[PDB]
Paper text:
Rhinoviruses (RVs) are the main cause of the common cold. Belonging to the large family Picornaviridae, the typical architecture of RVs comprises a ~ 30 nm diameter capsid enclosing a ss(+) RNA genome of about 7200 bases. The building blocks are four capsid proteins (VPs) present as 60 copies each and arranged on a pseudo T = 3 lattice. After the first 3Dstructures of RV-B146 as well as of the closely related poliovirus type 17 had been solved, high-resolution X-ray and cryo-electron microscopy (cryo-EM) structures of numerous RV types and of closely related members of the Enterovirus genus became available and have been used for the design of capsid-binding compounds. These drug candidates attach inside a hydrophobic pocket mainly contributed by amino acid residues of VP1 and displace a natural pocket factor—in most cases a myristate—stabilizing the viral shell against structural changes required for release of the viral RNA genome into the host cell’s cytosol for infection.
During 2D classification of the extracted particle images we also noted that about 20% of the particles represented empty capsids. Following the infection and virus purification protocol, we usually found empty particles in the range of a low two-digit percentage of total viral particles. For completeness, we also analyzed the structure of the reconstructed empty capsid (the B particle); it also exhibits an empty and collapsed hydrophobic pocket missing the myristate; similarly to the native empty structure, residue VP1-Met222 reaches into the pocket. This agrees with previously published structural data of uncoated particles. Finally, based upon our structural data we conclude that incubation of RV-[name] with [name] elutes the myristate from the hydrophobic pocket and renders the conformation of the pocket more like the pocket of the uncoated virion.
Numbering used by the authors:
A (entry chain A), D (entry chain A): 64 to 88, 98 to 138, 144 to 233, 237 to 274
B (entry chain C): 3 to 179, 185 to 231
C (entry chain B), E (entry chain B): 14 to 45, 55 to 157, 165 to 259
F (entry chain C): 3 to 60
Write the structure that this text describes.
């Protein structure tokens, strides 16, 4: 009994953390910097803790509307260069992880390791990127988790939507915190005023 | 020679298969010791947190929601406070245990309620703290509360009192959306010498006992 | 009784009743150190608690950056690490009444007093030994929202003690070093915030002393530094 | 011999307990509250007993008519919020079980555990939801089994029919009852008059 | 012989020939209790069996809600649990004839006397110690359909005994607690219905007694309650 | 190295394969003892029930 209140049960359930959409007719690619802060319901559960550490399993559910479409999904790890164009050199780099997926095949899945240079992710961070009045404060300073990039490989009028399902695995969590009592206004910020 | 079976190629969002590492050869940063690891949410439920008993429109934007007034200038026949014991509803819903239970459909086990008197060392008073079981109906008077399960608490002698409400329902769990009432009554007037405040505040707290359990997780708009 | 660390001495009988944060005693970093010249008690200027007070906070190590050998070690090394003993004393008569929560919050990332995505500014998050006494880049005043959008009734989830003026005039917190890295910049980042909030406001009748002093004494514990420079 | 009259053999055969249908052109989703009372032939066999306990295996046979269609099938457990709209927050909740299925793939299958707060389902219940003259009587009071929800994930004129096949598993049954002698009139009710 | 429980006593020689429902003796709830002050025989007002009678039913615990200590315990606790001994006696001459089935039905969810999806109302399903003597929210009168749409010839699948007036003047049913939860609301829900139906109607010649009494005595067994209130 | 065989990907309605639990971490309510468990219908066939011998329209 009480395994359903284990941290693996509470934080380790798959959820749609991002919603990549793009069109084709540059243009035919999209990118998303990976964070758990986008969706309030996911964010609130992770923010019950000060630090968390997990590997993460990505599953990408794709729907498309105008032969079968071919997509490249690319994971760019922290501090590596992110694509600027649909056929940039970054898509060919053997240091990025790519999965090529073709329509009607089972949805693509991969696990990213815990990538951070610190031993856990900071859900909160009481410090700065530097000394300046312009310097960032809070959990945006730490926690580059990488970027998910999508392009169509096929030659040509179509709309593509990719739901990024994420499951945290082998989860550890430290220093419990009061639950968020008021609405989230912005990503990584503790600000609450409407 | 294999047959795929009707589940084959599904993305079931609750599945637990292995999957390929995107980055073999990469070794993650070593896990150092960090104080205060949490392994189960029931560790957090066991912490005493303040009940916002004083829910009135003047107090709910402030620290004053947590403090119950005790005073000389009062109708001593009226209830001091009452708390419904269901963690599903006000005032318990925004406590840490009410918040953690809101992520689950079902709860069970014992609740510890604690009361702390914050008057001067020269202030003395008796309060009657009564528990009324579910379905019995909230006491209308100090005499009716005294005929039930109760503590006569002398706040002069003891600055803190506690009550453990054990699990009492037909099923081993109940839904997170009665458990009875805790009610407080004046047993005496508020007694002080000269040059002492003729009023004080009391703080109410709640936590889980070691038997507490939550079941069937759910996500819902109880936070926007 | 008497507590002595370095050339500093403080008096209190309550010292054995300390809360050890997360049950972990402070310690030197394991193989996977200036001692008592650094590890003194530094006693801050006492706060005036009144019936009007909303509470106070300090950030650590920031509150000690001007404090003797430990404050110099924060400038003369690139990275640092320490635990703390925080001793809070609050002397009063038998005729005063009030309740403080004394809490230590790890990574107390403040919300602003404003509606935008605007961050709290460095000048506001690093107040030094004076702390902030609670009343566009300034932090929240909402002590009832823990200055971070979370309810004050839930603040006891953090390492804490109550000071109830009828029962006890003091609280002691023992804080281990808490971070996701072994050592860090002592000037860019605060591991802990000390928060003192009146739950029940001070009351006393006229002719009693209307302000009671809250005295905060902080000792570094098991302090370690690396990358020394002259 | 006589395993074919075991309760697992008698109650534990797969049958079409529901027939979800919807159109697309709100609108593009449908829901069905799970019960065994919809189909008289299934219902009569379960109502030979007063109480039953089983896990249940759901298999969803889908046909559709105007690329390959993508559907999300979602199980909402007892007491969780059911979808009000095609892109409501409830479809993203990690506490619901979802299977994403795409046309021509083998039919989706999952097992729901025995979900009830009581130790068995009540086939009959001689009691009320409350004291009132409006209070419900009978096995509708107990036995929320959850809800099956369907939406199209694809962007756009189509008609979809989903046959919900259900097999009870690890079946236990208690307190045998006379067989139903007269027609069923309504779900959960013992009423029989035309 | 004589049977005594609490301060109540009843006379019958047949007591060893009781039917134990499902072969399970009543018992206190296992680790995974007022005794004999609660667990008396309560004897209901006797029914008049005549050649015109369609049968009778009672719901348990509802028929005992006004009955002494057990009836008070059903109001003064939130949840309860009990088994029962039901003893049915039917005194007659050697010149009377007739057949009763005496049956206990678990979860006897009544059908209405009406064609809609309309439920049977609470006033009708909770008749108390008087029961219902069978003649828009009222229950079915069809004793031949067990008031629930099932044939009377199949009623013997439930715990039952016959009273055949030539052979035996009495029946005894021992009922364990039967529910899908350990304890339940004694006022919202009935675990058992006692049903008495004449299969062969009463016959006697004129100058014999035209009504014969059916006397029902019910004792709670192993009764348990939780959530006590004054 | 596998070959699928002609039965592969069927929904045979009488099949008996394993399938994934929709809700891991969920523990079902404990099975209490309830009187009168039935394991086989032949237990019910062994009960004496009345024959409606007098089948006439009245």
């Amino acid at each position: 009994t009480r395994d359903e209140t284990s941290i693996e049960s509470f934080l380790g359930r798959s959820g749609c953390i991002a919603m990549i959409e793009f069109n084709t007719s540059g243009k035919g690619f999209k990118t998303w910097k990976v964070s758990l802060q986008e969706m309030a319901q996911i964010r609130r559960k992770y923010e019950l803790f000060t630090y968390t550490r997990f590997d993460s399993e990505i599953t990408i559910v794709t729907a498309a509307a105008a032969g079968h479409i071919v997509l490249q999904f690319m994971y760019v790890p922290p501090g590596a260069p992110v694509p600027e164009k649909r056929d940039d050199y970054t898509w060919q780099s053997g240091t990025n992880a790519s999965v090529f997926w073709q329509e009607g095949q089972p949805y693509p899945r991969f696990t990213i390791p815990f990538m951070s240079i610190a031993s856990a992710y900071y859900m909160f961070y009481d410090g700065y990127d530097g000394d300046s009045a312009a310097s960032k404060y809070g959990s945006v300073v730490t926690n580059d988790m990488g970027t998910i990039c999508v392009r169509i490989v096929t030659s040509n009028d179509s709309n593509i939507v990719c739901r990024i399902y994420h499951k945290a695995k082998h989860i550890k969590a430290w220093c419990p915190r009061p639950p968020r009592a008021v609405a989230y206004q912005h990503t990584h910020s503790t600000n609450y005023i409407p | 020679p294999v047959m795929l079976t009707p589940g084959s190629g599904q993305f079931l969002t609750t599945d637990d298969t292995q999957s390929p590492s995107a980055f073999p050869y990469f070794h993650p940063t070593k896990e150092i010791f960090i104080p205060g690891q949490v392994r189960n949410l029931i560790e957090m439920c066991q912490v005493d947190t303040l009940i916002p008993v004083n829910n009135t429109q003047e107090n709910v934007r402030s620290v004053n929601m947590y403090t119950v007034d005790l005073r000389t200038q009062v109708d001593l026949a009226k209830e001091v406070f009452s708390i419904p014991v269901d963690i599903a509803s006000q005032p318990l819903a925004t406590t840490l245990i009410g918040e953690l239970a809101s992520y689950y459909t079902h709860w069970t086990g014992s609740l510890r309620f604690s009361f702390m008197f914050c008057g001067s060392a020269s202030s003395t008073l008796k309060l009657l703290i009564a528990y009324t079981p579910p379905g019995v109906g909230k006491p209308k008077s100090r005499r009716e509360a005294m005929l039930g399960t109760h503590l006569v608490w002398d706040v002069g002698l003891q600055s803190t009192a506690s009550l453990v409400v054990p699990w009492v329902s037909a099923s081993h769990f109940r839904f997170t959306t009665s458990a009875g009432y805790i009610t407080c009554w004046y047993q005496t007037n508020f007694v002080v010498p000269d040059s002492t405040p003729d009023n004080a505040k009391m703080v109410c707290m709640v936590s889980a006992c070691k038997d507490f359990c939550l079941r069937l997780a759910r996500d819902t708009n109880l936070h926007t | 009784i008497q507590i002595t660390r370095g050339d500093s001495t403080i008096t209190s009988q309550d010292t054995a009743n300390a809360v050890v944060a997360y049950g972990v005693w402070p310690s030197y970093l394991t193989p996977d150190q200036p001692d008592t010249s650094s590890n003194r008690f530094y006693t801050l200027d006492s706060r005036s608690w009144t019936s009007a007070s909303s509470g106070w906070w300090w950030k650590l190590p920031d509150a000690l950056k001007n404090m003797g050998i430990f404050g110099e070690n924060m400038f003369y090394h690139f990275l640092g690490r320490s635990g703390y003993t925080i001793h809070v004393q609050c002397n009063s008569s038998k005729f005063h009444q009030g309740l403080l929560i004394v809490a230590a919050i790890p990574e107390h990332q403040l919300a602003s007093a404003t509606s935008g995505n605007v961050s709290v500014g460095y000048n506001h998050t690093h107040p030094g030994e004076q702390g902030r006494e609670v009343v566009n880049k300034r932090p929240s005043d909402d002590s009832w929202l823990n200055f971070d959008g979370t309810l004050l009734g839930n603040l006891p989830i953090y390492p804490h003690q109550y000071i109830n003026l009828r029962t006890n005039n003091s609280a002691t917190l023992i804080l281990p070093y808490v971070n996701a890295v072994p050592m860090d910049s002592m000037l860019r980042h605060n591991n802990w915030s000390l928060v003192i909030i009146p739950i029940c406001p001070l009351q006393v009748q006229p002719g009693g002393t209307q302000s009671i002093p809250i005295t905060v004494s902080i000792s570094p514990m098991f302090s370690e530094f690396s990358g020394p420079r002259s």
